[PDB]
Design a protein around this ligand. Structure first.
Ligand SMILES: Cc1cc2nc3c(=O)[nH]c(=O)nc-3n(C[C@H](O)[C@H](O)[C@H](O)COP(=O)(O)O)c2cc1C
Lengths: 94, 319, 191, 823
């Protein structure tokens, strides 16, 4: 696919995804599984006013990936913008 | 083993010229730690024998029996087999070669890895010491330690299982395994451990938390574990090619694992000593369960050495 | 402290009557065995201390392991013989004891428990015996009678409260306290 | 100590002149450098390899093909004192090789570049000044079994007052693809005047020049060295140039030649060469191309430096001790320079002693950086550069200090400084680029809209100010309110006035917003706004921030501002995985993909909020008959799982014919959200309460009874509970059950099939507000994870069919039918 066809396809698919996410369920269990298991994401930063998805990601990690993380020796740091701004910005207290 | 001995193994130069000593890490390295600890023990034995003015065999005749904790079994065998000064020198060289090969092949089989520094510094601040393949737990029963070991091992595969390595006493154990697994054990135990300085005088004993000293030992190999099982055959090949063996024991030298006297053993002394050093755990209570009124601790550490531990084990037994 | 006294007086006998928290009446929070394991060598360092065992002894078969010292092999320790055994709750059902006949029958009805689960008296009855809190704040082992039950409820809900809250709490539970004092406790409401 | 073990002699010839007894020894300087070069050639390459110094500097030097082995890796790692678990042979882990093994691979090629006759000097006085490694982007670390070939090129040969500086870059290649670059500097101490043989090849880093002015285009066209081969319209160009300097004197350039390719990113996102740079000059004092790009352009991946450096580790953990002997490093690395191992050679070189390898010091400090800065993960350390500013003897104690000082394209910049404890003088000064841990960026949807959120960032950061200001200006101009006012003050009511030309444009904006429902009946969102209306009042009991239409833009903007501050600080890894919850998807896309401008983003989220608000009928008091609850299976029972909730929800919906569906799948067996009629939601609440009371395990019911019997029991519960729900006076106010927590302030069952009617106008609005040029598929493939599919964005027929299975969309149907053309 040429870049222009590729852009056309991406634009169409993204528009449809955003349009029908309006009226389709949010599959946050599956999305957490994707970037926690397949990607083995370590730094899970949630950008928001409250640590909502930080808490949900911590709950999912404890529920399902507690043994997986130990087996792979993977240390997952869940950060919230409203709480762990120092850690996200790498600005520890001198 | 020039690939393993970067800074060399010329202990005489290190003693005469302290500026030339390698760093603490290299000294604590197992290929260096084993033979040098053997040299320390043999030097202590020689100092005792020569200060009292007897030959090695003459001093040995005064000993009802001898034994050793981990690599000290080799020195115990040497003093058992030594009769004259020439025989003692031969046995000392044989043991030095044996422990050099043991350390070299153990390091080759299980190279010294570095744990992540967040975990290292967390352990250091917690007081658990630097992570290492050996973790000393105290003040806990075998049942309790076994329960925590299951809690840790259920989350890990076979190749990273933790195993009991040194049953030093009722309230003194050492666990051997990956340093990451031992750190996980330490964190679990901390979660189930008393806070530092908690006042529990007015608390029921069954509801009292745990008071224990979980600390990583300064040993860089998982001694007495399946992780070093493959090194046994290599060490056997080394000793058979170099013609190293012990013979003519004149006092009992009791095994660390099954407690059997080495004089009655039919299989090669060096084969069995290597197998205990690498694979079988150490039942120190069973090894030292025999009669003794006076015990001489020749190992390193002095106050922190094996002698005080044996005193705690045998307190009020007349030893 | 007792070892200090013994060292101060090496020639005078000093009986150290060790009693675990499992003993009747006033009792400590300590296990019968664990302090003994660490301090028995220090005690035996003084030849004038006479170590006596208590807190849960009523028969020869259960007392002999402590007399001979074979109790310690179960803990992977050398034998630790005791110089004597003291008997408390065992002898309250005796003929010469002035305890009431009904009290003796209730004592016999109480089945008791082994040492592995004596500490769960603090939460619920245990073979007919429960722990309550005294006026001085120390724990007391008492038979789980109705009066002792009400004692436990008042420790859990009234006496544990601060003084500034006690009066209002008593006023709130005024009727229930009086009713159960008249029905269940040895000290009825005078009114 | 030679490569072939055969001893090699370095003869020094001295004429004896007894006539002059004051100085009777006269060193024969003729061919002295060539003799020393023959000696060093025999050392590094062996006696068998013939000596040949007819090497062309302008041609790359080809090294030998080397196969990496576990034995070699272990020996080298133990020699350098690296204890990283990535290099020990764990089965089934693909044992990696240290980045310091690059010098082992490329030693022959790199060191062959100081031998050429054009580069003449005393090798005994050669000193290694600096060494650095750079990982190629997207190149995996070296691993066991890799067949690697090294190509070395001399970047520069200069005469400085301290001596002749030689720069050599050796690129390693695996399977013909470059993996890494190793830059080394060697200084021949002394005085050199052979400026005819000097040169400097500098590959200038790509510079992005923005021409946002007719004068910018005018200056660019006035540059004679800039030629345009493709007549196109551009606003940003990327200049990639390769300057080549030739020196006639120390400060004078014999000839400057700069050749480069200027690139443009089309709206298609294809990068094409619109022109070239071709500058020639004779006697010159600088390069005008480099000066112009430096002054008028910003390099890609600017290094953002922290205000306060973060000290890593401590002076106890970072201390080290040099080895007593350098033979273990010399044999493994192939560097048999006698200055490190022979006392006589060091004495002749007038060195304090057998100085340890600068490359060994580099490897040890890089191992420290690997451990402490990179958390003992070898793939994270991407670049490591060091300067050999001092000399270290065996057994010296070194104190290393590491500071995280900045970032570059989301890669931590770690300044490392090694000094000698005995003398306190610096021995090593270096910098490292280390990837952050594998990162996902999660953006949150509605739920938290407190007054003043993001205002601390607004006041502190200029970039957050810019985001909020652009959004507020667009809102004021196109919709008649200030989102900053709404966020800061949270007024209960807000009046919009439509007077004037701008006000009438705002009124037309409000009038044009349609919405669809099931009678598809389409009508105005604001029925009461017509050509005659002068103003419109928004009202909210709990403040306008709690209204959807103002909650969504506010949260989207605070998230966009936070991400923009993070990006401007340079904390965004190149390999990220961004996702968003409900509304967070738009913020995440506008953040990491830049698909939506700020103005289009605020428009889209405002329209989405209004569509949600009006998607449901409301009574005279504004009360809707739908809603949402959050349900927790573990509260119902420990055996109650996601399949059990799915079964229950389906059966409650199917029996009473009322809309009731699981909308958000938050946490497995711990957090779900159900949307539907308040009738069916109270039905589910009391159903789960009575189920917990009855201790019914529907899993066992299904596993030990026919679905007819499980249906009999569950439907019986459903009938009783639905009768109770209908009995409760409508609209039903939900009550917090043991597992059910009604979502207060939510009156719309969004993310359910109810909004399928309202999707279609939103699709047209999205098509209008997403330019096709704004989509960068490279920023989406394998990084974007939607909520609809919950798998990484992919331009694959499988992915499109997965989307079609959920949406049944005509557009996706067309793409799937005609995928043959896209194949
Ligand atoms: C009714 C009763 C009264 C007691 N009074 C005292 C006392 O006044 N002072 C004291 O030191 N111990 C007292 N004790 C504790 C006993 O002396 C003894 O140490 C303990 O009962 C041993 O527990 P056992 O009955 O399980 O063997 C009392 C015990 C009981 C049962």
């Amino acid at each position: 696919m040429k870049p222009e066809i590729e852009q056309e396809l991406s634009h169409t698919l993204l528009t449809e995804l955003l349009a029908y996410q309006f009226a389709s369920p949010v599959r946050w269990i599956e999305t957490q599984d994707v970037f926690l298991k397949q990607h083995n994401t370590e730094r899970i930063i949630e950008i928001g006013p409250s640590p909502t998805l930080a808490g949900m990601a911590n709950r999912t990690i404890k529920a399902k990936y507690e043994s997986y993380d130990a087996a792979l020796s993977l240390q997952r740091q869940v950060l919230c913008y409203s709480k762990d701004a120092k850690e996200i910005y790498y600005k520890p207290d001198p | 083993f020039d690939k393993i001995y970067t800074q060399g193994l010329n202990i005489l130069s290190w003693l005469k010229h302290p500026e030339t000593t390698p760093d603490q890490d290299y000294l604590l390295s197992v290929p260096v730690s084993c033979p040098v600890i053997c040299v320390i023990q043999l030097c202590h034995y020689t100092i005792t024998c020569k200060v009292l003015g007897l030959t090695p065999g003459e001093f040995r005749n005064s000993l009802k029996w001898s034994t050793g904790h981990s690599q000290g079994l080799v020195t115990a065998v040497t003093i058992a087999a030594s009769d004259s000064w020439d025989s003692f020198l031969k046995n000392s060289l044989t043991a030095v070669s044996l422990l050099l090969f043991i350390g070299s092949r153990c390091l080759s089989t299980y190279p010294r890895t570095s744990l992540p520094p967040t975990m290292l510094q967390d352990s250091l601040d917690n007081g658990e010491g630097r992570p290492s393949p050996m973790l000393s737990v105290r003040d806990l029963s075998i049942k309790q330690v076994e329960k925590f070991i299951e809690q840790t091992n259920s989350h890990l595969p076979r190749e990273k299982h933790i195993a009991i390595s040194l049953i030093n006493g009722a309230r003194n154990l050492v666990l051997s395994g990956p340093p990451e697994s031992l750190y996980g054990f330490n964190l679990n135990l901390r979660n189930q451990k008393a806070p530092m300085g908690l006042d529990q005088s007015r608390v029921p004993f069954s509801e009292r938390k745990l008071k224990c000293s979980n600390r990583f030992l300064p040993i860089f190999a998982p001694f007495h574990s399946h992780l070093l099982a493959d090194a046994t055959e290599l060490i056997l090949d080394d000793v058979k090619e170099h013609g190293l063996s012990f013979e003519g024991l004149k006092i009992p030298v009791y095994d660390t694992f099954d407690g059997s006297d080495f004089q009655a053993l039919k299989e090669p002394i060096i084969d069995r000593v290597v197998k205990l050093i690498t694979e079988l755990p150490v039942h120190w209570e069973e090894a030292t369960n025999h009669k003794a009124t006076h015990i001489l601790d020749f190992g390193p550490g002095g106050v922190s050495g094996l002698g005080v531990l044996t005193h705690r084990n045998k307190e009020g037994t007349g030893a | 402290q007792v070892i200090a006294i013994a060292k101060a007086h090496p020639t005078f006998p000093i009986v150290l009557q060790w009693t675990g928290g499992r003993g009747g009446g006033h009792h400590s929070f300590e296990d019968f065995h664990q302090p003994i394991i660490q301090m028995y060598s220090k005690i035996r360092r003084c030849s004038n201390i006479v170590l006596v065992a208590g807190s849960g002894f009523g028969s020869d078969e259960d007392t002999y392991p402590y007399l001979s010292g074979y109790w310690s092999e179960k803990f992977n320790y050398p034998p630790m013989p005791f110089d004597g055994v003291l008997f408390g709750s065992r002898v309250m059902t005796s003929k010469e004891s002035h305890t009431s006949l009904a009290a003796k029958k209730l004592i016999v009805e109480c089945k008791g428990v082994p040492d592995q689960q004596w500490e769960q008296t603090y939460k619920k009855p245990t073979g007919g015996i429960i722990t309550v809190r005294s006026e001085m704040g120390e724990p007391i082992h008492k038979i789980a009678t109705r009066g002792v039950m009400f004692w436990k409820e008042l420790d859990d809900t009234i006496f544990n409260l601060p003084k500034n809250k006690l009066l209002d709490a008593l006023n709130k539970k005024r009727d229930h306290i009086i009713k159960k004092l008249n029905n269940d406790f040895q000290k009825p409401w005078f009114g | 100590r030679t490569a072939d073990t055969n001893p090699v002699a370095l003869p020094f010839l001295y004429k004896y002149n007894p006539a002059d007894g004051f100085a009777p020894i006269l060193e024969i300087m003729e061919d002295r450098n060539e003799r020393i070069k023959e000696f060093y050639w025999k050392l590094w390459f062996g006696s068998s390899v013939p000596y040949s110094n007819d090497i062309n500097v302008e041609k790359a030097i080809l090294g030998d093909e080397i196969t990496i082995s576990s034995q070699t890796i272990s020996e080298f790692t133990h020699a350098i004192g690296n204890k990283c678990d990535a290099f020990v042979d764990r089965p089934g882990k693909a044992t990696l090789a240290p980045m310091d093994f690059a010098i082992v691979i490329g030693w022959k090629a790199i060191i062959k570049a100081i031998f050429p006759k054009s580069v003449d000097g005393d090798l005994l006085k050669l000193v290694h000044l600096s060494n650095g490694y750079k990982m190629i982007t997207g190149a995996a670390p070296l691993k066991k079994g890799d067949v690697v070939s090294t190509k070395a090129e001399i970047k520069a040969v200069l005469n400085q007052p301290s001596g002749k500086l030689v720069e050599v870059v050796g690129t390693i290649y695996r399977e013909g693809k470059p993996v890494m670059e190793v830059t080394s500097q060697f200084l021949y101490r002394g005085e050199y005047n052979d400026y005819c043989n000097t040169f400097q090849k500098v590959t200038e880093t790509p510079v992005q020049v923005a021409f946002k002015s007719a004068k910018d285009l005018a200056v660019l066209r006035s540059k004679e060295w800039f030629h345009l081969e493709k007549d196109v319209q551009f606003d940003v160009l990327t200049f990639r140039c390769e300057s080549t300097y030739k020196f006639k004197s120390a400060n004078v350039y014999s000839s400057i030649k700069t050749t480069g390719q200027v690139l443009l990113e089309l709206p298609t996102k294809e990068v094409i060469q619109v022109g070239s740079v071709d500058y020639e000059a004779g006697t010159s004092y600088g390069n005008p191309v480099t000066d112009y790009l430096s002054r008028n352009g910003k390099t890609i991946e600017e290094s953002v430096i922290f205000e306060n450096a973060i000290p890593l580790s401590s002076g106890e953990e970072l201390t080290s001790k040099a080895p007593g002997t350098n033979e273990p490093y010399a044999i493994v690395s192939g560097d048999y320079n006698p200055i490190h191992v022979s006392r006589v050679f060091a004495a002749y070189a007038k060195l304090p002693g057998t100085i340890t390898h600068g490359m060994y010091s580099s490897a040890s400090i890089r191992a420290l950086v690997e451990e402490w800065a990179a958390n003992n993960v070898a793939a994270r350390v991407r670049a490591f550069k060091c300067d050999f500013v001092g000399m270290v003897l065996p057994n010296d104690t070194l104190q290393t200090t590491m500071e995280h000082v900045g970032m570059i394209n989301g890669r931590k910049i770690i300044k490392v400084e090694t000094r000698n404890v005995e003398t306190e003088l610096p021995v090593l000064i270096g910098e490292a680029e280390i990837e952050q841990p594998t990162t996902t960026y999660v953006f949150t949807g509605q739920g938290s809209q407190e007054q003043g959120m993001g205002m601390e960032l607004y006041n502190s950061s200029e970039v957050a100010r810019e985001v909020w200001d652009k959004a507020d200006r667009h809102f004021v101009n196109n919709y008649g309110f200030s989102i900053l006012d709404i966020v800061q003050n949270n007024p209960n009511e807000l009046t919009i006035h439509f007077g004037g030309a701008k006000g009438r444009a705002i009124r037309d904006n409000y009038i044009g917003m349609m919405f669809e429902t099931i009678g598809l009946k389409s009508e105005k969102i604001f029925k009461d706004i017509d050509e005659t209306t002068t103003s419109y009042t928004f009202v909210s009991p709990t403040g306008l921030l709690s209204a959807t239409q103002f909650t969504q833009p506010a949260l989207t903007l605070m998230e966009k501002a936070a991400y923009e501050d993070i990006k401007s600080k340079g904390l965004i890894p190149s390999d990220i995985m961004f996702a968003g919850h409900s509304l967070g998807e738009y913020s995440a896309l506008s953040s990491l993909a830049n698909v939506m401008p700020i103005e289009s983003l605020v428009d889209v989220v405002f329209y989405r909020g209004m569509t949600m608000q009006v998607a449901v009928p409301r009574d005279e008091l504004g009360r809707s008959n739908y809603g949402m609850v959050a349900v927790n299976p573990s509260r119902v029972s420990a055996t109650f799982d996601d399949s059990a909730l799915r079964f229950v929800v389906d059966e409650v919906a199917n029996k009473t014919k009322w809309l009731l569906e699981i909308v958000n799948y938050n946490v497995e067996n711990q957090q779900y959200v159900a949307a539907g009629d308040l009738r069916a939601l109270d039905t589910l609440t009391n159903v789960l309460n009575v189920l917990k009371i009855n201790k019914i395990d529907i899993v066992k019911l299904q596993e030990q009874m026919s679905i007819e019997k499980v249906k009999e029991h569950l439907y019986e519960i459903v009938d009783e509970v639905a009768a109770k729900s209908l009995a409760k006076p409508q609209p039903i106010d939900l009550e917090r059950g043991f597992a059910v927590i009604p979502l207060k302030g939510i009156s719309v069952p969004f993310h359910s099939s109810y909004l399928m009617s309202g999707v279609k106008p939103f699709q047209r609005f999205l098509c209008k507000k997403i330019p096709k040029s704004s989509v960068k598929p490279q920023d989406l493939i394998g990084k974007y994870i939607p909520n609809l599919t919950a798998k990484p964005f992919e331009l694959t027929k499988e992915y499109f069919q997965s989307v079609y299975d959920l949406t049944k969309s005509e557009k996706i149907k067309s793409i799937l039918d005609n995928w043959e053309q896209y194949e």
